[PDB]
Amino acid sequence: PNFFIDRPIFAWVIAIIIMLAGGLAILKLPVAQYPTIAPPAVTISASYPGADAKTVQDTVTQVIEQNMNGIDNLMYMSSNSDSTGTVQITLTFESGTDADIAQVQVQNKLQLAMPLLPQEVQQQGVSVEKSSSSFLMVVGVINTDGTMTQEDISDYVAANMKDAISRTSGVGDVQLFGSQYAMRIWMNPNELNKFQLTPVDVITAIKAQNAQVAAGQLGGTPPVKGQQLNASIIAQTRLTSTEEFGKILLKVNQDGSRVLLRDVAKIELGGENYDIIAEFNGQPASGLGIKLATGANALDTAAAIRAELAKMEPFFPSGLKIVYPYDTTPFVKISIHEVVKTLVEAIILVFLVMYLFLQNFRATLIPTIAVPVVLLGTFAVLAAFGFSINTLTMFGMVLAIGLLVDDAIVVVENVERVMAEEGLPPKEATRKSMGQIQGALVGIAMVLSAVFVPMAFFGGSTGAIYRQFSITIVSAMALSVLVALILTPALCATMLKPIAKGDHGEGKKGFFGWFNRMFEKSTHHYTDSVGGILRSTGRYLVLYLIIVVGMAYLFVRLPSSFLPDEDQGVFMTMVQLPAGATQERTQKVLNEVTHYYLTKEKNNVESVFAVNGAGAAGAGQNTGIAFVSLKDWADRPGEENKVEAITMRATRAFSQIKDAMVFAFNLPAIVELGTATGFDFELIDQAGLGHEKLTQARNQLLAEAAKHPDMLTSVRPNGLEDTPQFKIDIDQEKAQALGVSINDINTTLGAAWGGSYVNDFIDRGRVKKVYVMSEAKYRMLPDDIGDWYVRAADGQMVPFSAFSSSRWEYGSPRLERYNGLPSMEILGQAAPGKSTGEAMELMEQLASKLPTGVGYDWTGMSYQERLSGNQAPSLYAISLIVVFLCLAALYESWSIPFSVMLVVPLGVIGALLAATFRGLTNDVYFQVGLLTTIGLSAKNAILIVEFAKDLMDKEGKGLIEATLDAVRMRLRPILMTSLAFILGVMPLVISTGAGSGAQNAVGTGVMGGMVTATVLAIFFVPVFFVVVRRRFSRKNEDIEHSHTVD
Amino acid sequence: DIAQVQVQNKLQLAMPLLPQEVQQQGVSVEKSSSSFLMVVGVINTDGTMTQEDISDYVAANMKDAISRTSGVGDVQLFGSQYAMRIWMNPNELNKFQLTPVDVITAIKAQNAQVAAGQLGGTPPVKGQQLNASIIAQTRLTSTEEFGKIL
Amino acid sequence: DTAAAIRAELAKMEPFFPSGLKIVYPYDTTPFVKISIHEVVKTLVEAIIL
Amino acid sequence: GADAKTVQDTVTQVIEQNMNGIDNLMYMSSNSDSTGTVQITLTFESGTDA
Amino acid sequence: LPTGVGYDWTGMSYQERLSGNQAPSLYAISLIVVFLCLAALYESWSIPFS
Ligand SMILES: CCCCCCCCCCCCO[C@@H]1O[C@H](CO)[C@@H](O[C@H]2O[C@H](CO)[C@@H](O)[C@@H](O)[C@H]2O)[C@H](O)[C@H]1O
């Protein structure tokens, strides 16, 4: 402290060391958009081709839900049993659990369940994965020539690119969009009755002829003596071409005219699945979703991947061009450009405020060295704690440009003051001044970490968001007061100019700031004033409570956000067709939507990625989804040219004009979180009941909540409602007669209409599948059932209509389970200005109006909200107590802390003022902001209260005289700090361009807060101080003429 | 945890060399104190159900969640969950000239779900308009329809 | 704490139980750990007072 | 039974396709033998948790 | 060798190529630390250069 005054070089060395650590930690520090925030979930997925909802729910789903146990830290189980044969069991774990352990343990209980599965599922694959819906990129591959189909392209994807990109530095998970080439063999029902054959015979034919064989070796061990030759018996090799599959022999006819497979079926290299069709502006396309590697450079993973893709550009086939429908990268690059712009802008402002106020170039340079240094270092402390440059942490730093700016200003000011007041040369001046502010500053460090640390401890995904802020800011601050104590006092004692005693430079110069008088008169005005306002304090205690009450009202009205919705350069629109619809209808709708975007939005849109089959609801021809890419924002000027009005005019288009519901929206900021003002209700069956009764209970609760539009709003299920299905009752009696095997009946019906993955081959070097399914025109409408024949042991064919009863009924196409038992998921939010928690209470009281065997429970968003929500009071209680205790220590008082803690309202009010006059919302940013403001306001209170006491004691001055003196000397720096600040933050508040959502959320609260805080504080702080001090002691007193200095 | 995974990683090298009755009965790899943490009991005060009635409610309503709770290693049930218990008569089998094997292949063939497919499925024919779920053979839900097994 | 989690899970299952099904508690190392260490607390506080 | 090209095209490189994104991996090297044996070695950045 | 045939080092010679490619930066950082360290202890810029 006093130490580094006489050691400017040791100070420089600590500076330089921290700077080098900064630049070093800055070069090699990750960049991601946001940090890891979702409470880890592993996904088990199994595809059971052909299976209906109940078949996967009962054969795979429940057998795995029953063998999942003994895995550490299980929060809940959620299960999709989809009628496209797919099962998705999503195990979401307690937050911050080892993803690695969760995945492996889950999978090791799964491999224990593996033999208890059907063999179709066992061979199709059950996969355990770590769930992130946040793909760094979706890279598109298209074909302009018109040459290639979806699967053609897809195959090229899988066999030329998919894994060369998967090399590039920064790439973790690689995923392909579409389906790879399989041996697609399409049976003909006529040409199968012709030569008297069923699927089973096709099947064993294909297994037998297309395989490897456990061979042997010449000259093997043990040998015979004198041996000399050793080589490998090459046995049966699998079939390379489609032709060679045509050649496979099903049966020989009696006269020798033989039957090769080609005759009974159409044969082709085809897709392994044809559920989803991917169009890129109508153009044939497949895709690849690349993930940023588990903690690496987003922007350099992007630069490397795009550079790598182009090395493959000279070896890409005809008319094959690459495209980028979804790109986190330019939005993050631009986020960062604006954080660097802001911090350096704020800093420049500080130079203008500091010069055009102290007019000493060497005084002006000091903070210019002071916070860059705190900057670099702050980076280094976060580097050490394992963090990255994402949005939350960088705005975590901007959010505290002010405490840093303040820290420097406080000191330089106080020194310049000591010289202008006392005439001391600079060295002795900096010791007098550090001697003055040192203890206070350690105090500010203890009150600032007393407010900023309780906000590091929240639980669930909210706590994560906060932890980033807590540590960024506590570290900027910690290193800030450290710099404040080591270097800058050395920089004041070492490059600061001596001021002639009582200089003040009134007039003394023509071409620059007659201002000094203009400042001076006024600062006397300020104190001329203040004593009068002390002279009858009464009114202000009224005014104060007025304001305090107001602060509350204005506050209770502020709406309760989570984060601002950002125009990401990218938004999407999804399509839901009526029940049971076909690939063709949905595909029509996607085509229309695309035309609308590319035309009636020709100034804006750049790309549509129409995807048929994948929709928001779940899987099925039924659903459709479109990724809509916009041009770069320097080509989208106006208000009606940006995502807000674009999405609004797109749903405008598609609502009023269709037979199907097609909605458009922009993605949320953090790609997986709560809708803030709502919930996610799962209605559960705990007693022994079937789907009928549970859905009935669901409808009952659906109506019971439509009866409260005053609390609850748009209470809906998130799934597919019962569609009609087609039951084929096999009368085993009839087929028990005809000499057919029930096996062959089931499995021919199967391999016909659902299909059969049967065997494996080797295409051009890469192993791929062999599928056998009926051709198109012989398996579409229930009539085609007839065209299909099963052969008995006695040689006689049988039509299906000979033993197949058939009807229509309903069935559920999507069977959900919650924690092992049948459930139906109810989404919902609360009516406008009603609490989410209230809606939750009314929900529990409504679902309590349901039959026994119907129970309820909470998940995800409303899960973390029902456990962690009583923390907000307790942590700021710890905060209040810890700060009060800290000040009590810094002074030597159980009462004086009150005149400074009382300043806190004075700052909150303007931010609320500001929220409302800017129509913004109480989101996270506003709140970290709240604190920041409270922070400076309190710091200033602390320095005023200190100087007051310091006079009162260590000069003998009296209460009023000394509070006057105090406030007097602290007027100029508050004003300097506040100007540089309000002027640094200013650009945030009025700025559009990517991440303006954030910048505005921040800026508003701060600027308003700063305004009402300084302009209030400079009149209330002496009153707090003066009033509170009159309840202590009982005498000795008001007071002066005292005494030692000893 | 690491040990569990390594031991179980050698168990995956023994898994195919075990019988299919064992593999389907389930092999379990666990971490667990050799002592009982607690014994939770359920009864019925009236007698309104026998032992196995209850035991079934225990194994089919509760046990799956006690055994998922984080921190629970081994759960051991005193008793058993309901199965379709079918008690052959050796005489009544010698009569119609039948062995257990016929019971087995019968029950295997008659009682199963079936991969059926979709009307108007993927890939479809042009001009299509119907898409819905073919339901085939379903599992035998009740106790009677088990007698009717042919 | 495993015991607290289990009391919670069982309390979730309480309302969809059939006619007259009561849980009963034959064996628990748990209440002893609490009451034993609690008697060590009663002692700390008393001793302070002495 | 399979020969080297058969294991390297059916088993080996179907495994190297999934070894992406694993943390603190220095290099990968894989042997494809014609006695049915396939052997992959992942060498990690030094001091990585084994 | 022909266009498209390349080289790399692994195991021992990889670790040796790391030792040498690292050797310069190690002598720059250690020299710089001694210098700051001395500039600090002996409050000077002259003691360090000399
Ligand atoms: C950063 C810049 C801040 C912008 C400030 C712009 C002006 C708005 C606030 C000015 C506050 C001064 O308001 C102050 O109020 C008190 C009333 O209690 C007056 O006080 C008056 O009444 C008291 C006793 O009744 C007497 O001392 C009397 O001599 C008189 O001073 C002061 O004369 C007035 O100076």
Numbering used by the authors:
A (entry chain B): 2 to 1047
B (entry chain A): 101 to 250
C (entry chain A): 301 to 350
D (entry chain C): 51 to 100
E (entry chain C): 851 to 900
The authors write:
AcrAB-TolC is the major multidrug resistance efflux pump in Escherichia coli, where AcrB is the efflux transporter residing in the inner membrane of the bacterium, playing an important role in capturing and expelling a range of structurally diverse substrates. Crystallographic studies of AcrB have revealed that large substrates e.g. erythromycin bind the proximal pocket in the access/loose monomer (access binding pocket) while smaller substrates e.g., doxorubicin and minocycline bind the distal pocket in the binding/tight monomer (deep binding pocket).The proximal and distal sites are separated by a short “gate” loop (herein defined to consist of residues 615FGFAGR620) that has been suggested to regulate the progress of substrates through the export pathway. During efflux, large substrates such as erythromycin are proposed to undergo a sequential export process, first binding the proximal pocket, then passing the gate loop to the distal pocket, and subsequently being extruded out of the cell via TolC.
Wild type AcrB and both gate loop variants were crystallised in a novel crystal form at pH 6.5. Crystals of AcrB belong to space group P21 with two AcrB trimers (6 molecules) per asymmetric unit. The wild type AcrB gate loop is clearly identifiable in the new P21 crystal form and adopts a similar conformation to that observed in previous asymmetric AcrB crystal structures. Overall the backbone atom positions for the AcrB(AAA) variant are similar to the wild type gate loop, while the AcrB(ΔLoop) structure reveals the gate loop deletion to be remarkably well tolerated. There are no obvious structural distortions elsewhere in the structure for either gate loop variant. In summary, we have presented two AcrB variants in which the gate loop is disrupted, either by reducing bulky side chains or by removing it entirely. These variants express and fold similarly to the wild type AcrB, exhibit the same oligomeric state and trimer asymmetry, but are significantly impaired in their ability to confer erythromycin tolerance.
